[model samples]
Target: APAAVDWRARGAVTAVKDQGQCGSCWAFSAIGNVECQWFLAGHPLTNLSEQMLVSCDKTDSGCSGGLMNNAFEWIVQENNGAVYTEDSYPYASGEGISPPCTTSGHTVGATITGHVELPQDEAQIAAWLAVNGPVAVAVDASSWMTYTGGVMTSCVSEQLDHGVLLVGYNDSAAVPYWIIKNSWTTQWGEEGYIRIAKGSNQCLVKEEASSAVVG
Candidate 1:
C-alpha cells in the first residue's frame, strides 16, 4: 500500500528556508533533500550552506539559473564537497544577488556519498519518498505566485524554471495533491508550502526529481 507521511512531524525535514530570489531555489531545493537524509542517518539536524553551492558549485550558475541534478553532481562528484554549516558560511544572497564564495570556516558540516534520480511516475516517486525523505525537484512554478489554499488545479504549462523539495503527499484530499516545500519564505503561500494535483502532471512535477544518499 502507498503510505502517506509528513516528514516535518518526524523531524526528517528541516525548518523552511528563504532563498529570496537569485534563482538559488536550486540551492535550497537540493539542500532540503540533503538535510533530511542527514537527519535520517542518525545525525543531528544542521543547516548546510546553500551559499556554498550557490557561490561555489560551478556546475550550475549562481542565481542566473541552475539544474537540481547539476547541484547534486557538484556536491557529490565534482567537489565531493564537504558542505559547511549555515553559521559557518551564512547565506547572504537575500536580495536575489549572488555573493562571493567563502572558505573562512574551511570545515565540513555534512556530506553525501551519491544521489539518485527518481522515476518519472509520481506513484513510484511517492513510495520512494515515503522511505527516503524529501527529494529535490524542478517544476513549472510560474503560477505558484498567487496560490493561497486548497488543491492547485493548473500550474504546469510553463517551462521548469524553479527548483524545490517534494516533502509529502495526501491521497485522501478532495483532489490528491503532492506536498511541496518551497524557498520563497514563510510569508508566501501556506507559509512557504503548496500542494499541486498529483497522479496528474501538474507543472511536470514528476518529470525531474532526485534524492541524495548519506549514512
Candidate 2:
C-alpha cells in the first residue's frame, strides 16, 4: 500500500453536506460511500440522496439515528438497488423533522449490489481504502464538540454514536491519521472533514468500518 492516499484528490468525494439538527448521519455515510463507489465504477460522481434513505428506508430511524450497514442493505433489497439523486429527493430534515417517504417522480442516480464490512483493524482498513475508495464508518464523536482543526489524538473510543465516511489516510505524516468526511457541514472540522489518529482505533472507527459496493 502507498504511504498515503486521498480520494478527494481523485474526485470521488462530493462537497461537504450538512445534516443540521437531524440525526441522519447514518444515511449520509452510506450514501456517501455509494457516491464514491459508483464514481470509481466508471460513472459520473452524482450526489445521491440521503433524504431518500432517511425518509424511505424502514429499517432505519429517520432523523433520529440509524446504521450505515442497514441503510446499504435496504437500498439493495427494499429499494431495488435504486438510489435517487439529491436534486430529485433533496434533503428536508435539516430542521430535525423527518418527512414521510415518497416515491413519485424521484430520479435514480446510482445503484449498489451489496456492501462489505471491513475487519476491525486500522491497517487492513487503510490498505483497503488505498485502492477501493472511501469506506463508511461509525464513530464515537462525543468529544468532537471542542474540535476545530489538526489531527485529533485525545478522544472517546467506546460508545459509538455518530456515522461518517473514511475518505483517506496519511501514514507518511509524523502522526499518521485517518481522513474522515462528516455530515455536520463545512463549518465543522477541516472543511467538513476530520483526521483521527490512526492505528490507535480512535473513536471506535475500526469497529464499524464498511462500504457500499457498486457494480
Candidate 3:
C-alpha cells in the first residue's frame, strides 16, 4: 500500500514580489513551484521564465493577475505539454502588454502533464506529492509588496494576490517550512520565496490549491 504524505512536510511555501504593475502573477506562481520541486528532486536549480508562460500560455492573464489553476490547465490541456528553460525563454519583466501566443517563436522541452487539486490536509498534500510532482497554490499576498520579513503578522486583509509552487516541506524545524519559489527578481525574501506559518488560513488557496506534474 502507498504511504500517506503531507506536502507541508515537504517544505512548500508562499512567495511574493513587487509586481509593480505587471499582471504576470500567474506565471510567477506557476513556474516558481515547478522550479522548487525540481530542486527538491535533486535537479539543478533552474529559474523558469515567467515571460514564457505569460506570453505563451493562453489561459494566463498577462498583467491583470490570474488564477494559478488556469495557468496549469493551459500547460497540461493546451501548451502541447511543453516546458521551456530559462535560457530558452529568459525573464522579461515589464509593465507593457504581451502579444498573443505564437508557436513560431516559442520553444519547449518538457511535456506538461494534466492538472490536479491539492489535498486539504497537510498529510494529504504530502501524499499527493509523494505520488505526483509539484503543486501550484494561491494565497493572500497583498502584504507581500511591503513584506521585509519577520513574524508575518498582517492577516487582517485576507487578500489573495499572489501564486506560488509547493515543492516540499520540513517538519524538523521549530516551525515547519513550506519550500516555495518566487519571481521577485531574486533580491527579495529568501531568494524570492519565503516559509510562512503553514495551515494558517490554508494558504493553499483554502480550496483552490491546484497543480500540474511534469510528464
Candidate 4:
C-alpha cells in the first residue's frame, strides 16, 4: 500500500473533456494519456486534438466507436499532421453529426513512437500511472452510464465497451481504488472521474491498459 498519488495535482492532467453523444471515448482516453505524457516529459501542457481522430482515422471508425491501440497507431504511423491542439482544431461532433475532416491547421505537439499495453496486474498498472504517466484503457462501462459517485461496485462482471484514462490510485482508503478520468464531461460521475475498486478485476476487463511513448 502506498500514499495517494494524483497526476492531476501534479500538473500532468488536462481539463475534463466531454465526449458528447459521440462514442469517441477512445479518442479522449488516448489523447488524455498523450497530453499527460507530453507534459510530464517536460513540455508545457498542450491540449491534443481528439476531434481530429473523430473526423479522420479510418482505421478507428471515426466516431461510432474505436479502440485505444488503433488510435495510438494512427497517431504514430499515418497521421503526419499528428495531435493538433483542441484550440487549433476544436471538436465538433455528437448527435450523430461529425465535422468535415480537416488537417490544415494541424500541429504536432508531441511525438509517440508507439503505445505499450500493460499487463493485467494492479501493482503493474499503478506503477505505470505513477512513474510513466496516465494510461488509456478499455473497460465495461455499462454500469457507468448512470454512475454518480462513490467507488463503482455495480459491475461485478466484465463487458469492456469503453475507453478511459487511469490517472492515479489510493491504497489507503477503505475501498481502495484506482482514480479514472472519464470523457463524458464533468456532469457524469464524480466530475468526470471514477474510482474503480482495486485488485478484483471488477469490470472483468483490465488488460487493455496502455501508456503513450511521447518522445
Candidate 5:
C-alpha cells in the first residue's frame, strides 16, 4: 500500500454534499463509493443520486435511518444494479421528508454488480483503498459535532450511527490519519471532510468498511 493516497486528488471524488436535517448519510456514502468505483472502471465521474436510495430503497428507512451495505444490496438486488444520475433523480429530502420514489423519467448513470466488505482492520482497509477507490464506512460521529479541523487524535468510538466515505489516508504524517468525506456540506469539518487517527480505529472507521464494484 502507498504511504499516502487521496482519491480527491485523482478526481475520483465528487463535490461535497449536504444531507440537511435528514439521516440519509447512508445514501451519500453508498453513492459516493459507487461514483468513485464507476470512475475507476473508466466511466466519467458522475454524481449519482442519493435521493434515489432515500426514496426508492424500500429496504432502508430513508430519513429515519439506513445502512450503506443495505443500500448497495438494494441497488443490485432490487434496482437491477442501476444507479440513477443526480440530475435525473436529484435530491429532495434535505428537509427530512422522503419524497415518493420516482418510477420513471430517470436516467441510469452507473451500475454496480455487487460490493465487498473490507476486513475489520484499518491496515487492510487502507491497502484496498490504495489500489481501489474510496470506501463507504460507518462511524460514531457523535463527537464530530464539535470538530472544526485538523487531524483528530482523540475520539469516542461507540455505536456507529453515521455513514461516510473514506477517501484516503496519510500514514507518513505526524499522526497517521484517514481522510473521510462527510455529507454535511462543505462548510462542515475540513471542507466536508474529517481526519481521524488511523490504526487506533478512531471512531470505529474500520468496522463497517465496504465499497461498490463497478464494471
Candidate 6:
C-alpha cells in the first residue's frame, strides 16, 4: 500500500556502479531506477547493465549523456529491450555498436513506466515510490567528485552533470539522508551513491522529477 502522507521513510539504500568514464548516464539511471523498483517489488537485487541500454537504444546519445525520457522512449516505443545482467553486454568505454545485437543472453523483465516530473517534497517523493517503484532525478553533481561521505551541507560548488535514482531516504541520522544510486564505480562516494544531507539542496538538480516502473 502507498504511504498515508506524501513523505515516508525508506528502509535501506544501495548504489549502482556507473563503470569508468562510460558516459552512459541515461542508461545508468534507467538500470539503477529499475533495479530499485525490482527490489521494492520483493525481488532480489540484480546488477543490470547500462551498456545494453546504451548500445541497443538508438534514441540515447551514447557518451554525450542523454535524458531519462529518451531512454524510456526507446524501451517502450522502439521495441528495443533490456538485458537481465551486466555480463550480457560487458562494459566498453567507446560509443555503442549497432545491432544484429551481440548481447542476447539476458532476460527481458517488464515494460517500464516513466515520468518527466516528480514532486519535490519528501512526502510526495516517498508516496510516488510506494506506488510506482523507483524514480530518476537530475541533480547538481558536477563537484560530486570530491564527495567522500557523511551529509552534504552546501551546494556552493555543485554543478549539474548527470542523472541518478532516488531509491530511498532516511531521517534517522542527525540530518536526513537521500539514498541515491550513482553511475560511478563502486570505489567512489558512499559505494557509488552519496548519502547527501537531505534537507539541504546539495546534490539535487532539477525540481522536476522523472520515474520508471515495471509493468
Best by lDDT: 5
Model 2, range 65-127, lDDT digits (tens) per residue?
999999999999999999999999999999999889897889999999999999999999989
Candidate 5, poorest ten consecutive residues by summed lDDT:
206-215
Clashes of 6: 7
Tens-place lDDT per residue, model 1, 42-88, is 89988888998998888889888788788877887866656787777
Give Cα distance to truth, residue 100, candidate 4, Å.
3.0
Per-residue error (Å), model 5, residue 12: 0.5
Q: Model 3 shows how many backbone clashes? A: 23
Off by over 4 Å in 6: 1-15, 42-44, 80-84, 94-106, 113-116, 130-132, 157-159
**Model 6 agreement with the true structure over 12-75: per-residue lDDT tens digits:** 2344564565667767886777666655667666666677676777777767677777777777
Q: Could you tell me the TM-score of candidate 2? A: 0.99
Model 3 lDDT, full chain set: 0.61
Better structure of 3 and 5 per lDDT: 5
> Candidate 5 lDDT, tens digit per residue, 1-215?
99999999999999999899999999999999999999999999999999999999999999999999999999999999999999999899989999999889999999999999999999999999999989999999999999999999999998999999999999999999999999999999989999999999999998999999986
Ranking by lDDT: 5, 2, 1, 4, 6, 3
Q: TM-scores, in order shown?
A: 0.94, 0.99, 0.74, 0.94, 0.99, 0.77
lDDT of each: 0.83, 0.93, 0.61, 0.82, 0.94, 0.63
Error at 136, model 3, angstroms? 1.0
Which candidate model has the greater lDDT, 4 or 6?
4
Q: TM-score of model 4 relative to the true fold?
A: 0.94
The regions of model 4 sitting more than 4 angstroms off are: none
Tell me the tens digit of each residue's lDDT in model 4 across 94-164.
67577878858666677777878899887778776778878888888878877889997557465688888
lDDT of 4 at 73: 92
Q: Which lDDT value does model 3 have at 205?
A: 41
Q: Give a tens-digit lDDT track for model 3, residues 23-88.
A: 787787777666655555555556555777777776656777677777777766676666676667
The candidates, ranked best first by TM-score, are: 5, 2, 1, 4, 6, 3
